[PDB]
Symmetry: D2
Subunit: 295 residues, 4 copies
């Protein structure tokens, strides 16, 4: 037997950083959860009990805190690239670093219509994520994403004209509820190294904001023919607005809300045009994915 | 042996309701999770296998949908009271109904600075809850609450002057992070029945909004001497603003963020005034509770 | 305004303890999660910012580890009583301690049919719990419980003869699946203090084992007329086997498995006597409770 | 823009099946959660709103129940292959089916030392899983796995001789607690189609049992030099026992239990050889992976 692939590191490292502006007194907080996994010439730790090749996962944890102390932690694409590059430059036998970062929302509070200098609220479990793979001699590959964005529209969604055979019971509809949790990922063109990542720093926050805005606007305005059709429109717009993205991937659950027939009870009308009360379904759920790239 | 207490019913009943304004085209959605438990002369179902006394839990589920179809579902204090009263009026041998409602946020989306007519976002897992106990011959007791409101302030929290003995290692501090998940409950004076609950309907939403606002403002502005001291100030203000509340209860975790000493690494300074990077702690956590009532 | 009730302390304190038999080489592990909340003359910490009355929650955490170091941690009823008594004896102004303990399963592994000396498996998320309230001048009240015991029987459950009215759609049945997560609590007679708790130590593990065995046997053997009828039989037997228990409480979800009518597809028969494939329902669920005490 | 990849289907479909032996009266239950995603000539549903190519996800759900009605659901490798093959044979434009199955434990109860005919217990959240990819013209690829197997050993684990530099604070140790949640996957050689999968049916349950047994025995008996070294030994043995497996992958968290220094309190000794009470750490955690294949 032989080691075909191996990676190891530290997962679930929670980090908080505060920035204090001495002039204005305004404080800004960042909180993230970080995972770092390494690859390289480490087979002998598995096959021969040779620990000499292991950078201890506890040391990786230390490195994350130290790196956050000495560098900006925003945008996460830059922080992840700094962190990944560190390991391949510092350790001769480590040849790849894989860095995953989940950014948690801490939104500045408005008290009496003005921004508070040092108080924050978690407005939703929506996350902004990055995956950074730093591979020696092959540059830096970055995938950025938003996830946990939960939306619903109560009309202007349709689903008709699908294949009907002996396995089909689903009725066609011209008016339904559509609700989903959005997971959207955009993959950047490969960067040659940290200098190139630094040169594009302004594009990271801007593209995240664009992806979010396009998602919300298209969802709200599209008279949706299907999840498939609507998500494609989203991806197409993002690719058109940022030339440095190669692909956009969406993964969307279709969270069903079922009509409840109440006609058995005193002829009560609660279906079709008369539908007011619905039963949200916890499971099963549709799952629809697509990856859109350039012609 | 004898039955000392018994209650039974349906839990986790998810309900969605939509309201459609025909004039404006504006739609508004409500989504809740409902639990209804009944008490009464039902001992024989336990002791003698006499099912004749059981209103099936499946029927309770049906009743929830039917009631939501025929009545407004907002404010939840009113809907819960209607639902509870139904069971004690309909069934001779049922003498109490306990109704718990969790309201989930569906916040109207703003697209291009204007409110969208039928698209919504889940902005946070914060909930608005009610517990309604309708007891035959004793009226209606309502406890209203908000929960899952997660906040953090990065300074203006202190904790010093606590008891120090041979079990104490905690250092006094004049500047720390304070973060909590707020659970706040206000208990209404007993209402004689549904007519009285209806007469106070405007106070329910208004008091919820006040409780939320007082919580946020006090948290952000108090130079906090302890969780205990700050939460007391919150409760005091709520009681002063709404005479129909008898008690306010807060239950607050103290979610710790620990300094990380980095001085072992090249003398790096990251404690006290130099603290920038912290380690959020998942567990253990302080838990601080208090119930405040009138003199 | 005035403080009507207050309690504070440390929640979610994870503790592991190992016992090493030097003779046999056999090791035994215990793992628990502990919560301790205190009450007493502490109002001024809320109302006057007087921290002098506060035993820091961090010190409570320390005390839990120290107490576990110096005392046995099993049975949990004894450990919780020692821990609670400590606070009321040590601190003049503290007059009640509330201790909750969740014990996690670490079951010794059998390798090649023999018990391994130091390797363990988590066989299920079933927990054994205690709640201990130590109140100065009123002794020690202990509630013991098991929770998270998930069972299913595929036949020998019935449900017919329930009330039928205009809210009822549920069909009577003489053969259904019954599945539940068992939560069972037995409340001990009040103990005068630690000496009395010590004198009954052998009864704690024995009663837990009896409660578990009665639950499983009765569930498996009862031709159940309802959840209500079956749970009553369980509680009755536990009370008969241990005179020092005053009350037994069960709280049981009814986790529904629905028939699936497949007759629309080529006349396929999958209901009543022909039912083979079912759809487990995540929600809603029946919830049935009862407290049984002595005549 | 163009569709580079697309897949869609139904997730979280819960299924229960019962088998009734008419002779013996013995009943056996199976419960699973199933996900089916399809690929094929479906781009136009995304790009042109052409629903004619969509097999509705609701129909996929129906197909899962129908298939479970007409076929055995065990071993899951066979059921998943039947289910995947169905879609590529039934629909001309569908060219791949991806089927994921999670099997939940329902273990027959022993009452008074004998196996009960129709009552079951969920003994742990351990799962047995399969991923089956059926690709038209390329056969059937099956990955089988166990996950959620949580173990701990209290001694006979070491970790010393790792790289030490200016990022390292971790002390070497010759005696520590080792605890992990096992995720192990074995990948079968490609099968040409359903006939070949059927011919190997006995090997599926046997290999699962072997993988489990090797994991447990090696964990309990290895005087572990590291997670890396121990997991390699597991994978090596599995590959040696089943020639039809091509690769074995393990993914293992290192769930840390920290010593607690209590010497500040009356010189209490709780570290090194005197360590009895430890603090389980919820996060961060080591994560160690490896894929082992044949020379
Ligand atoms: O078994 C281990 N492997 C590792 O790679 C490691 N790093 N810190 N502790 C560790 N333990
Ligand atoms: O055992 C049951 N008890 C009940 O009260 C009930 N209601 N619906 N189904 C039921 N089953
Ligand atoms: O605000 C606080 N209250 C307390 O009771 C406490 N105990 N430790 N830290 C603390 N902080
Ligand atoms: O938008 C949808 N896409 C689908 O593929 C589907 N299948 N059932 N309902 C559906 N809705
Ligand atoms: Na390198
Ligand atoms: Na009544
Ligand atoms: Na006292
Ligand atoms: Na095909
Ligand atoms: Xe951070
Ligand atoms: Xe609702
Ligand atoms: Xe413990
Ligand atoms: Xe199944």
């Amino acid at each position: 037997s032989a080691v075909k692939a191996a990676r190891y590191g530290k997962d679930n490292v929670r980090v908080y950083k505060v920035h204090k502006d001495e002039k204005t007194g305004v404080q800004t907080v960042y909180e993230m959860t970080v995972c770092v996994l390494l690859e390289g010439e480490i087979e002998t730790s598995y096959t021969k009990a040779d620990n000499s090749v292991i950078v201890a996962t506890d040391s990786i944890k230390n490195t994350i805190y130290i790196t956050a102390k000495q560098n900006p932690v925003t945008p996460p694409e830059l922080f992840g690239s700094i962190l990944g590059t560190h390991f391949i430059e510092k350790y001769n036998h480590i040849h790849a670093a894989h860095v995953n970062i989940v950014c948690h929302r801490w939104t500045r509070m408005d008290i009496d219509g003005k921004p508070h200098p040092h108080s924050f609220i978690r407005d939703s479990e929506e996350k902004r994520n990055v995956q950074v793979d730093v591979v020696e001699g092959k540059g830096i590959d970055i995938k950025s994403s938003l996830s946990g964005l939960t939306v619903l529209k109560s009309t202007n969604s349709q689903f008709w004209g699908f294949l009907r055979d002996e396995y089909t019971t689903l009725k066609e509809t011209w008016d339904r509820i559509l609700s989903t949790d959005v997971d959207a990922t955009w993959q950047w063109k490969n960067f040659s190294g940290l200098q190139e990542v630094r040169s594009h720093v302004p594009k990271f926050d801007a593209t995240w904001a664009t992806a979010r805005e396009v998602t919300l606007k298209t969802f709200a305005e599209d008279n949706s023919a299907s999840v498939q059709a609507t998500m494609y429109k989203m991806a197409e717009q993002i690719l058109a607005r940022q030339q440095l993205i190669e692909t956009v991937e969406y993964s969307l659950p279709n969270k069903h809300y079922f009509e409840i027939d109440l006609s058995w009870h005193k002829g009560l009308q609660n279906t079709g045009k008369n539908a007011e009360v619905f039963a949200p379904q916890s499971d099963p759920n549709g799952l629809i994915k697509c990856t859109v790239g350039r012609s």
